[PDB]
Amino acid sequence: KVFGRCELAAAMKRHGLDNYRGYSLGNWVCAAKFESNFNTQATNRNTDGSTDYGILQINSRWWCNDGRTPGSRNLCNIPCSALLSSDITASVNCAKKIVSDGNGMNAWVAWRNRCKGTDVQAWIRGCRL
Ligand SMILES: [Cl-]
Numbered sequence: 001k002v003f004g005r006c007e008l009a010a011a012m013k014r015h016g017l018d019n020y021r022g023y024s025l026g027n028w029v030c031a032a033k034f035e036s037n038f039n040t041q042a043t044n045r046n047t048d049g050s051t052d053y054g055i056l057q058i059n060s061r062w063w064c065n066d067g068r069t070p071g072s073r074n075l076c077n078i079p080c081s082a083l084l085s086s087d088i089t090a091s092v093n094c095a096k097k098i099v100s101d102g103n104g105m106n107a108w109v110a111w112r113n114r115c116k117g118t119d120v121q122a123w124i125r126g127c128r129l
């Protein structure tokens, strides 16, 4: 599913991401934009042979089982394919573990490089939330 900006903001607020660990809704939408272009089906292979999955490009090296990343953890205890669903529940719950693990939203390179220190509130401007 390819979300609208405001549709995704609204889906994310309902799943408890608005200000989760001090990160305003704008941050999560900005990261989804540059990670996946708001496409739940987004996949990308890493140089190490791990794969990034879904709206927030969650990595098979640490977070999900794709059965092809040797010596990887499944710290969200899910198949990576659950992260590609039009239901973002599995992606949101897993992102809550990731942003709690000590590095906050710096775990997402696109956030660090494209969202951090920008006006992120711009990403939810005009949305009915
Ligand atoms: Cl933090």
Ligand code: NA
Pocket (backbone or CB within 6 Å): 060, 061, 062, 063, 064, 065, 066, 069, 072, 073, 074
């Ligand atoms: Na894994």
